[PDB]
Design a protein around this ligand. Structure first.
Ligand SMILES: *Cc1c(COP(=O)(O)O)cnc(C)c1O
Ligand SMILES: *Cc1c(COP(=O)(O)O)cnc(C)c1O
Lengths: 356, 356
């Protein structure tokens, strides 16, 4: 008994993803954003395909060093680091960090003085990113601190509706790159960040994005042996690789006929993505559709005792039975990584497949 | 170095809270809601003051049995339980569960047939609670299933502005109580739920609520040796016992003068309460106020790489320095229990004091 929830993860989906990356963005070396999903098999698979890693804390630095990815394949791309975490990266070989302001540079001068610093420009956030107005002052201050500033990076953010933002960002990157060189800094890295779609049927497809990037790149950043273009794709690699199966643990009928299904993972667990990632989810019954079937408005609710722990407000389902299974596809990204064990509940075991 | 964040927890605040409970609600035996905060010291202190426990899963049932609380001090107050979790509670001596619908009673008939079932009525939620219109049918179905229905419960929810709700709820509980008796059921438990304030300066104070409850109680549920009144207070006991100190790990100045403070816990961590609990928090500087001090609009931001990980949008603060400490009071409730280690960050160690 105990029909516990579980993920099937398809590591082959990760390989196919990489294959397309390489074909649509051959100038660009991906540093996987480990905060997306840091499952050990997903890390090892990506390590094996020869991906870089984008890590955001000492813990993520340890985990990828744990699988014997050398330091050079890691960018520590967190603009605001605790000073001891910098210390750690300095002790692990990790030397490329980012920053977006001068205060951090002062930290860096005092803690990791030969680090290769990448300057991140706003694009995404009030939280992160230098405005391009402030870069000259920033870069003059960098000079007084004797910082080795070696490139520019931005981060369009995880749901653009127009690809132009990349193109805008890249142009902006050329301007600050140029101030970089003007003031004597050895600028040779362009990091175009994260945000690509990880489900191959999003509205704005990966391929358009790759095309606008490539046109921008050719116009502002002509190939050069001194220049490396890099990115920090997160959901790209993993969104659609993981599928969740959840058991309907409880059932309510309202007499019009509507159903309430209670399942055994929810917004404190894998569906935290509804709260923190703006995710919308589609419940699929794993029983195969039966010809003519009656379908009724349904809510599905997670196991916790909280009224806000709700996964779906009104979705057409066949009449379901306690002990049956709902599938949610595309549950690779920002899903295991945000879970909590609020209320006693424990998160889904992961099972792994290789689509050969 | 590594100015890690940490909680000071004052177990004596728990004892004081218990003393007040007993003085203002002497007819009522509290079953602490362990999902609120299941820290081992908070459980052991409550268990020693002689509290009951409200548990919602097999894990919370284990934890409180782990500290040698016998089964009878446990109510398993989750209306919609996974059938193997029922099985567990049956194997651990836990026999009082609740329910709000007939579907569950079918499960209970099949899994834990001699269980003392408490019927929970809506009050709180679309998610939980039987409408009072449906209780007669519900209770007739219970009888067919041979359920031992032994009482009524409700749950006003965690932030009422008028205490009348309890009074309303209690009246309603008398109605379903009375159908219970009419149909041959041994009704002797009234569980008035959770929702009381846990900071002794909320707008609607504990004491008004205790007064409305007691009036309602004396009017609809006169003292009787056969009747036990019970409750499920969660934040009551712990909200104000815990104080969070967080290190400012990063600083931004905007030239009017405003500041951005980045600290090393945030909404994937102890401030998940902003997202899931409707919490508002007040950042206090731990340096003592200096006479005349200049104060400026400030945001404080959590360590994570997400733009939505923001703690405070505009709060007046003295100018702060990297390496200083912000204190957040009242951070007992729905704070450690929701945390995740999104992005590599690890949650605050807790330190314990006894206000003697
Ligand atoms: C959040 C993040 C990423 C990854 O975002 P995706 O949309 O998953 O590709 C990459 N880089 C930085 C700096 C980020 O914050
Ligand atoms: C959430 C909950 C509680 C405790 O809520 P508080 O506001 O912390 O007192 C008690 N009982 C049930 C059934 C709950 O869902």
């Amino acid at each position: 008994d105990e029909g516990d929830p579980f993920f099937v993860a398809d590591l082959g989906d990760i390989v196919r993803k990489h294959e397309t990356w390489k074909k649509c963005l051959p100038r660009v070396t991906p540093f996987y954003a480990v905060k997306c999903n840091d499952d050990w098999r997903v890390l090892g698979t990506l390590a094996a395909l020869g991906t870089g890693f984008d890590c955001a804390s000492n813990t993520e630095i340890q985990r990828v060093r744990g699988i014997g990815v050398p330091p050079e394949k890691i960018i520590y791309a967190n603009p605001c680091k605790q000073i001891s975490h910098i210390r750690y990266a300095r002790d692990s070989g990790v030397d490329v960090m980012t920053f977006d302001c001068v205060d951090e540079l002062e930290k860096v001068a005092k803690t990791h003085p030969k680090a290769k610093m990448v300057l991140r420009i706003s694009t995404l956030s009030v939280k992160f990113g230098a405005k391009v107005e402030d870069c000259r002052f920033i870069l003059e201050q960098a000079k007084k601190l004797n910082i080795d500033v070696t490139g520019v990076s931005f981060h369009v953010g995880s749901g653009s509706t127009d690809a132009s933002t990349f193109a805008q960002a890249i142009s902006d990157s050329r301007f600050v790159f140029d101030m970089g060189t003007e003031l004597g800094f050895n600028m040779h890295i362009l990091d175009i960040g994260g945000g690509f779609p990880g489900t191959r049927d999003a509205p704005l497809k990966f391929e358009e994005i790759a095309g606008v990037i490539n046109n921008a790149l050719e116009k502002h950043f002509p190939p050069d042996l001194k220049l490396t273009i890099v990115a920090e794709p997160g959901r790209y690699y993993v969104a659609s690789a993981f599928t969740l199966a959840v058991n309907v643990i409880a059932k309510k009928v309202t007499p019009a006929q509507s159903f309430m299904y209670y399942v055994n993972d929810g917004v404190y667990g894998s569906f935290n993505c509804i709260l923190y990632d703006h995710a919308v989810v589609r419940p699929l019954p794993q029983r195969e559709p039966i010809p003519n079937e009656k379908l009724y408005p349904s809510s599905v609710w997670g196991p916790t005792c909280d009224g806000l722990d709700q996964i779906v407000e009104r979705y057409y389902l066949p009449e379901m039975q306690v002990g049956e299974w709902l599938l949610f596809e595309d549950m690779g990204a920002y899903t295991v990584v945000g879970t909590s064990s609020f209320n006693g509940f424990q998160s889904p075991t992961i099972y792994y497949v290789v689509s050969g």
